[PDB]
Amino acid sequence: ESLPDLKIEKLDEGVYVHTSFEEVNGWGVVPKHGLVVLVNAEAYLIDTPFTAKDTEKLVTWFVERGYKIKGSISSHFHSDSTGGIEWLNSRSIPTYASELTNELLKKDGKVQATNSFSGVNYWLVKNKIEVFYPGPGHTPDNVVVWLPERKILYGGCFIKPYGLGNLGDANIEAWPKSAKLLKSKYGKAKLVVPSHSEVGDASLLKLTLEQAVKGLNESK
Amino acid sequence: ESLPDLKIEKLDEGVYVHTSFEEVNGWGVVPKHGLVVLVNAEAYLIDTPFTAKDTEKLVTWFVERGYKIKGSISSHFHSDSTGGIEWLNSRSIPTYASELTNELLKKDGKVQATNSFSGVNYWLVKNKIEVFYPGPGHTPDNVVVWLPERKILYGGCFIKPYGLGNLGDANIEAWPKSAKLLKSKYGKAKLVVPSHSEVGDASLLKLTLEQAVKGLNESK
Numbered sequence: 001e002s003l004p005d006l007k008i009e010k011l012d013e014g015v016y017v018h019t020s021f022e023e024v025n026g027w028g029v030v031p032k033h034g035l036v037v038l039v040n041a042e043a044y045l046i047d048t049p050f051t052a053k054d055t056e057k058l059v060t061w062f063v064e065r066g067y068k069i070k071g072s073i074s075s076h077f078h079s080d081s082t083g084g085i086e087w088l089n090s091r092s093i094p095t096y097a098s099e100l101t102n103e104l105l106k107k108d109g110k111v112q113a114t115n116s117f118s119g120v121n122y123w124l125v126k127n128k129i130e131v132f133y134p135g136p137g138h139t140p141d142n143v144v145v146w147l148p149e150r151k152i153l154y155g156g157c158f159i160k161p162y163g164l165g166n167l168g169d170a171n172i173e174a175w176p177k178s179a180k181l182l183k184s185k186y187g188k189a190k191l192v193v194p195s196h197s198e199v200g201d202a203s204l205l206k207l208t209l210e211q212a213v214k215g216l217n218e219s220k
Numbered sequence: 221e222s223l224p225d226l227k228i229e230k231l232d233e234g235v236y237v238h239t240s241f242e243e244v245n246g247w248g249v250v251p252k253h254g255l256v257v258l259v260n261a262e263a264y265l266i267d268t269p270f271t272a273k274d275t276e277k278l279v280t281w282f283v284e285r286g287y288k289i290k291g292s293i294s295s296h297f298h299s300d301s302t303g304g305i306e307w308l309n310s311r312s313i314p315t316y317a318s319e320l321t322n323e324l325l326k327k328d329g330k331v332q333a334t335n336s337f338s339g340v341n342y343w344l345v346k347n348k349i350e351v352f353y354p355g356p357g358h359t360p361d362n363v364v365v366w367l368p369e370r371k372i373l374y375g376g377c378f379i380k381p382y383g384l385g386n387l388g389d390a391n392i393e394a395w396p397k398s399a400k401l402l403k404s405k406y407g408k409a410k411l412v413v414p415s416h417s418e419v420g421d422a423s424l425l426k427l428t429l430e431q432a433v434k435g436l437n438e439s440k
């Protein structure tokens with residue numbers, strides 16, 4: 001009853017940052033940055049908020065401003081990213097996730113996205129919104145979303161610059177490699193939006209890569 | 221190996237947010253917001269970074285652009301506010317802290333501010349930079365800085381909207397009252413400035429109060 005409200009603060013041109021909040025872990029109120037991303041009048045969720053409620057808030061806000069929600073993408077299985085897939089499905093707004101993410105959802109008892117991509121990249125919107133799979137990291141399934149009609153990267157929960165955070169589902173042997181490949185093909189990054197931090201730049205790749213290796217020897 | 225670097229961003233007309241970074245215990249790489257505040261061509265540190273390095277960076281930075289560093293104020297005895305007081309003292313830059321902060325630093329074996337103040341209010345710079353003491357909260361000594369002319373409030377480690385965090389030196393019994401006082405005396409603030417969070421508005425007083433009462437009953 002004192003969960004801070006959803007925030008929808010424009011980050012660039014046809015590119016919003018929705019910030020939502022929840023507890024569980026024992027970190028207290030954890031904030032979750034996701035992007036809304038406009039294509040003409042088509043809105044796109046770049047993850048969901050934690051809850052159905054704040055998804056409907058997010059949708060109505062855009063719906064009410066004369067954009068028509070064309071799809072959801074979730075960047076990994078955690079509700080960080082998937083929290084709103086139930087709602088979207090019950091409104092039969094199309095939801096997207098990788099085969100890996102959908103398999104992890106199934107395992108977790110969590111309604112799956114109604115669409116599956118696979119492979120290294122999905123062009124959710126040709127030329128405009130790209131999904132890229134660096135490999136296992138934060139989770140085994142984590143993917144990121146590239147904005148070519150700008151130079152924005154949604155790292156999601158993968159980018160963890162201050163320390164890797166939740167490790168429960170994490171693949172820490174693999175992460176430093178996955179990170180490396182992200183920093184490589186995703187140089188030329190203006191903005192790099194993490195899940196759980198302030199928005200930065202292409203260093204957050206370096207910073208992540210660094211945090212990644214550190215755990216790799218701090219637990220062997 | 222690689223801490224994030226200091227950041228010095230423009231917050232308002234003679235008011236900046238320095239962000240500094242350090243690994244804190246099992247809390248990992250924690251970021252720390254303080255203000256630089258310009259009066260005429262005189263510069264004031266509203267807290268300090270963690271280290272001398274980052275303090276010297278912050279200082280020379282400003283001296284570089286023609287502003288003379290007239291003093292530092294430290295909002296509480298922890299290193300997140302006081303980390304710079306020895307560097308400051310060793311350049312004969314005046315450092316300010318409350319008698320309580322100073323007593324707590326001495327306890328802690330930590331070099332004290334060379335200038336001491338007391339009471340509810342203290343006018344560091346008449347009409348321009350106000351110190352307010354809510355009461356025990358985050359720590360027993362516990363001060364915030366009001367900026368009238370701009371209507372800005374540095375809440376420090378006292379604003380903890382997402383959960384209270386370090387309660388090693390905390391006083392959770394008293395904290396609720398303190399925040400109640402702060403909330404009330406410090407409406408007509410849209411620019412609240414937490415220690416460890418995003419900059420926010422007056423609701424941060426609402427939310428801190430909320431977090432504090434909650435940890436008052438969750439701690440019995």
Ligand SMILES: [Cl-]
Pocket residue numbers: 085086087089090111
């Ligand atoms: Cl559903």
Ligand SMILES: [Cl-]
Pocket residue numbers: 074075076077096097098101141142143
């Ligand atoms: Cl996915």
Ligand SMILES: [Cl-]
Pocket residue numbers: 098099100101133140141142143
């Ligand atoms: Cl995947």
Ligand SMILES: [Cl-]
Pocket residue numbers: 198239
């Ligand atoms: Cl920041």
Ligand code: NA
Pocket residue numbers: 075076138142143144155156157158159
């Ligand atoms: Na991700």
Ligand SMILES: [Zn+2]
Pocket residue numbers: 076078080138139157166
């Ligand atoms: Zn996650």
Ligand SMILES: [Zn+2]
Pocket residue numbers: 078080157166195196
């Ligand atoms: Zn997460």
Ligand SMILES: [Zn+2]
Pocket residue numbers: 296298300358359377386
């Ligand atoms: Zn503190």
Ligand SMILES: [Zn+2]
Pocket residue numbers: 298300377386415
């Ligand atoms: Zn602190």
